Design a protein around this ligand. Structure first.
Ligand SMILES: O=P(O)(O)OC[C@H]1O[C@](O)(CO)[C@@H](O)[C@@H]1O
Ligand SMILES: O=P(O)(O)OC[C@H]1O[C@](O)(CO)[C@@H](O)[C@@H]1O
Ligand SMILES: O=P(O)(O)OC[C@H]1O[C@](O)(CO)[C@@H](O)[C@@H]1O
Ligand SMILES: O=P(O)(O)OC[C@H]1O[C@](O)(CO)[C@@H](O)[C@@H]1O
Lengths: 287, 287, 287, 287
């Protein structure tokens, strides 16, 4: 019943992760103790911690219309796109790039150097990658530190869950209609998939990573480019899911290959177990 | 930024609630720090705390085949049916009756004297009623105490969420098929409902209480009496939802009116906002 | 086992207390998780929280050589003298005055409008007065809030503890030698006092408040004006102890009547139960 | 800012330590949330956890007149003498022996196989030895686990603190009078020692371990065999202090060599830095 602790390592990049984690720890505490005030609060925490890391030059926040330029004295080599408080478990999402303007935060997901999400549940969980797989951490609030709980997390090749808001059925495009119909009425004599949809993206993506299956927020008639934001929701989770052996697509190309045309750009998002996402792509190509 | 605390009151019944809350506090801590071992653990906590209250004579647990008879020395006037660890937020569910045998735990829900659930999320939340409405509490683990956060909680007359596993579509009975079709394709020119389904009953019911709408685990071809257990899942949440101004039905009668034929009996469960449950009943009566 | 919470009230003064408490909550967390770095850290927390209250114009910190002048935009009517991390339980001490220069922080203790200390033990405790007695609070870190635990705390008229570093005996002045001799060898056939000395001033003063008796850090040959600092150690605790019915003296006048000649001025400090401090004064007057 | 955790190891003995730690974690929580009821509570926690380890045959508790004999089914090879709640930081003290009667708990300290104390401060700290030095742990209540913070703790050869209740001066024996006089008036031109006395034995002993110096509760006229209890206060701390390179004596023999004549036997206790305890012994031998 006794433990020893050891520092874990995945310069400026490490200091930058360290401060992003410190802001997540603060947000975790502010969520445990709890709407727009909490969003405003979570935003200042990230921005201010990120800036005083001395590792940033450009921030993009879901909460701010324009990119935020780090004061010239505190400037470093990295760009951070984040959703401070997304969404039941709500979350925080971020992706880090190397670079002094918006140009720098408009790089395709392929260029990501580190990305992560935090999920604020019974425990605060962080999934993190710096390009060499996905590691899962739990916030130990007693220590003030994040504890490694799983190394090199891998998603199942194929799952048995599908996850989307089916209340948008009347608006679905033909490929989504077809895919959902196949999940409920398999044509191969297999059992239908189970359905799960928390309605909080970080909660649904995290379940998709650890249980397998597929998560979808595709284009539909009311949102013809999807709802979820490319820079600081879709690209970071696509990066995490790909690092875990999964796939993430807009329907017509990998999310990480999309060339961003604006910082608050939305894209469709379909991700998860590779065989499930490939079967979704087949419905697209056929329609 | 300073507070005063005051003891809240909703003899033996109070001591019984007090120990059920103490077991919930212990379960909360064991969940935060985390599968069958946790179920075994949560079970002993409830059973042992409930017994040493000196208020029980008969327990029914989701985990135990037979009813548990309190030792003759520790016996009191009450019967408790509970699911120690149900299920993402998992939960604990319980209902309390006045009474020395199984007979006593086979009373219809109408006879309930107190019921509740706990939800183990970013915060541990307890909904509780003793017949005079629903009160919502948060576990303050620093104090070891449950803090009143909402008095006399009322569910909306009509919501805009529907909540069920649509992966069972191929197995749905005609009334469920019809109801779901109406939620997605309203015939009155209104917007379709949104869909949410966490797949943990306490999580879905709690959302249904605070946001409004409808939750369904109806009979289907694979589970022709439903999945959820009458004594310690369906009756307690039906009791809470009715105390909040909602409805809870098996499709053919109020859950609380069902006369239990066995302690692990399953029933269908449809509950939530009264106008939503009434519209579901209309699809049943018409089929 | 259930509680209700109610906001407690003892404009700018309230916002100022609120931020001083918020800095104490942060310091509490940084102490739980733990030397000069912690002092530097505790200092920035107080200074920065105090400044953004918009209620301060002048700060005096044990950690800073010169008084700190609040930026003109954030200025308010109050002056705060504090020891961010003093000292086994360590503590934080502060006193608040109404006022733009050092002049304002050089007022005698008599002018204090609010004062307090925090003690970081198994629980974090705050004693606070705004002139109408002493109230005791515990930090509930789960809530992020301070909970009233005792109202209008009163010190015993006479105690049975004396508290001083007797390792300075060879340096004691004649009155301290005489007083200590009387505590150990009572001339009235009473039992000797017990001795307690934690060596952390907030710990010893707090014990003196709740158990009664006397605490002394008098002048001696090596420290002929005492060790403890007038502005942000001696005046605040003198204010608290007097508000609890006790006395606090330098030996030759009440601490609160001393006219400060510099912001880091030291004074002797003798305080506690009034009859004990009066007996100490008798030894002084006689020598 | 990320950590990995690793199980630490110092069969039945390990399970026994594990349960003693689990009772300390429970006591820590009950102290944080707080007199005789807490003593009664702390006692049942130790006794019940110790018994269900299946490693005990005989317990001796400061709280119970007679030794407690483990039920025949749960019996194992070890004997545990403990003070569940001693005493400002209060503590828990225990020593473990291999063995079915009182005989087994009346072994001299020399036979100890493991001993420890817990101190309930801003953090809950455990000092533990199983014969190969002293290791220091902090309770991480988030994890529910004890974290190694210092390995093979060593006390200074000679310190500059002395720690005793000087309010018993009129009752001191000649050697204690002489020793204290030498601490305050060194005859070698060195500075006087500082004095510290919390009045809680675990607090004073812990300070003595980490800062060095000497702690004394010697025989005096009112307590001619001392106050502190041999089996579950003096022997465990003597064992810890000796494992850290210190000494612990009654004045006339090492505490660990005293042959116990009764389970609640008191002995004088002088311990700490070896050169300080040796100088105390010189005052004894000379008187
Ligand atoms: O209610 P909808 O249309 O399903 O939206 C769900 C999505 O909206 C958000 O709450 C907003 O980002 C996401 O977290 C979630 O995936
Ligand atoms: O996976 P299904 O068939 O939707 O089952 C969901 C239900 O099963 C449970 O996990 C078991 O009680 C419930 O908490 C939940 O409502
Ligand atoms: O070691 P000494 O001289 O007794 O000093 C004790 C005093 O020093 C301090 O640690 C410094 O402020 C006080 O907290 C305490 O009262
Ligand atoms: O008040 P006294 O006589 O100094 O007693 C102090 C001792 O008493 C106790 O509180 C009782 O065990 C010890 O923790 C402490 O060492």
């Amino acid at each position: 019943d006794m433990l020893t602790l050891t520092r874990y390592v995945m310069g400026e990049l490490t200091q930058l992760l360290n401060s992003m984690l410190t802001a997540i720890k603060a947000i975790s505490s502010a969520v445990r103790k709890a709407v727009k005030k909490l969003d405003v609060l979570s935003n200042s925490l990230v921005i201010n911690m990120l800036q005083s890391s001395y590792s940033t030059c450009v921030l993009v926040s879901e909460e701010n219309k324009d990119a935020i330029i780090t004061a010239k004295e505190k400037r470093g080599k990295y760009v951070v796109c984040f959703d401070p408080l997304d969404g039941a478990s709500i979350g925080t999402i971020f992706a880090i790039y190397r670079k002094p303007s918006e140009k720098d935060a408009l790089q395709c997901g392929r260029n990501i150097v580190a990305a992560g999400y935090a999920l604020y549940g019974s425990a605060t969980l962080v999934a993190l990658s710096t390009g060499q797989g996905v590691d899962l951490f739990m916030l130990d609030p007693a220590l003030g530190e994040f504890v490694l709980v799983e190394k090199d997390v891998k998603i199942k090749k194929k799952g048995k869950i599908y996850s989307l808001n089916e209340g948008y059925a009347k608006y679905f495009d033909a490929a989504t209609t077809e895919y959902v119909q196949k999940k409920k009425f398999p044509e191969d004599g297999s059992a239908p998939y189970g359905a799960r949809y928390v309605g909080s993206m970080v909660a649904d993506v995290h379940r998709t990573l650890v249980y397998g299956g597929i998560f979808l927020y595709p284009a539909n008639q009311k949102s013809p480019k999807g709802k979820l934001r490319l820079l600081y929701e879709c690209n970071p989770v696509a990066y995490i899911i790909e690092q875990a052996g999964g796939l993430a697509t807009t329907g017509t190309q990998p999310v990480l290959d999309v060339k961003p045309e604006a910082i608050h750009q939305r894209v469709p998002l379909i991700l998860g177990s590779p065989e499930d996402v490939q079967e979704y792509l087949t419905c697209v190509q056929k329609n």
